[PDB]
Amino acid sequence: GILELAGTVGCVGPRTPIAYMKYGCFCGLGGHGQPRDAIDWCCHGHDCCYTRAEEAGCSPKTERYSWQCVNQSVLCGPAENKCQELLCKCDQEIANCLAQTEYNLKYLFYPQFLCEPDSPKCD
Ligand SMILES: [Ca+2]
């Protein structure tokens, strides 16, 4: 859920999870176009992961799962069901992806209407 997502990102990265609430073309609700930078690419991959999760009958925004932060690393506990395993994997992935990125203020609160119609395909 959003709680785990915020927590996992906060656990590994150098900045507040809120820094990615509205950034570039993909960090934030929905998203399309050309990912503006490394951070935006992390969000694109995360959007893709969440979509796969949603198609599997999971609820990315609220489905709770067990995890732990040890030495700034996300540990996904033994998953009970597939959805818990998938979501933790998704959040763990974006948290790791964002950890070594540089933040570009020009993309903070970037106007979504400037984002192109075509987006990169999901893996
Ligand atoms: Ca998004």
Curated annotation (Swiss-Prot):
Keywords: Calcium, Cleavage on pair of basic residues, Cytoplasmic vesicle, Disulfide bond, Glycoprotein, Hydrolase, Lipid metabolism, Lysosome, Metal-binding, Phospholipid metabolism, Secreted, Signal. GO terms for cellular component: acrosomal vesicle; extracellular region; extracellular space; lysosome. It is an enzyme of class 3 (hydrolase). Ca(2+) binds at F26, G28, G30, D47. Optimum pH is 7.4. GO terms for biological process: arachidonate metabolic process; arachidonate secretion; axon guidance; cellular response to leukemia inhibitory factor; cholesterol homeostasis; defense response to virus; erythrocyte maturation; fertilization. Found in spleen, thymus, peripheral blood leukocytes, pancreas, lung, and colon. Expressed in neuronal fibers in dorsal root ganglia and in peripheral tissues including stomach, white adipose tissue and prostate (at protein level). It catalyses: a 1,2-diacyl-sn-glycero-3-phosphocholine + H2O = a 1-acyl-sn-glycero-3-phosphocholine + a fatty acid + H(+); 1-hexadecanoyl-2-(9Z-octadecenoyl)-sn-glycero-3-phosphocholine + H2O = 1-hexadecanoyl-sn-glycero-3-phosphocholine + (9Z)-octadecenoate + H(+); 1-octadecanoyl-2-(5Z,8Z,11Z,14Z-eicosatetraenoyl)-sn-glycero-3-phosphocholine + H2O = 1-octadecanoyl-sn-glycero-3-phosphocholine + (5Z,8Z,11Z,14Z)-eicosatetraenoate + H(+); 1,2-dihexadecanoyl-sn-glycero-3-phosphocholine + H2O = 1-hexadecanoyl-sn-glycero-3-phosphocholine + hexadecanoate + H(+). The active site is at H46, D91. Its cofactor is Ca(2+). Glycans are attached at N71. One of its GO terms (molecular function) is phospholipase A2 activity. Binds 1 Ca(2+) ion per subunit. It is found in: Secreted; Lysosome; Cytoplasmic vesicle, Secretory vesicle, Acrosome. It comes from the Eukaryota. Inhibited by methyl indoxam. Secretory calcium-dependent phospholipase A2 that primarily targets extracellular phospholipids. Hydrolyzes the ester bond of the fatty acyl group attached at sn-2 position of phospholipids with preference for phosphatidylcholines and phosphatidylglycerols over phosphatidylethanolamines. Preferentially releases sn-2 omega-6 and omega-3 polyunsaturated fatty acyl (PUFA) chains over saturated fatty acyls. Contributes to phospholipid remodeling of very low-density lipoprotein (VLDL), low-density lipoprotein (LDL) and high-density lipoprotein (HDL) particles. Interacts with PLA2R1; this interaction mediates PLA2G10 clearance and inactivation. This is Group 10 secretory phospholipase A2. It comes from Homo sapiens.
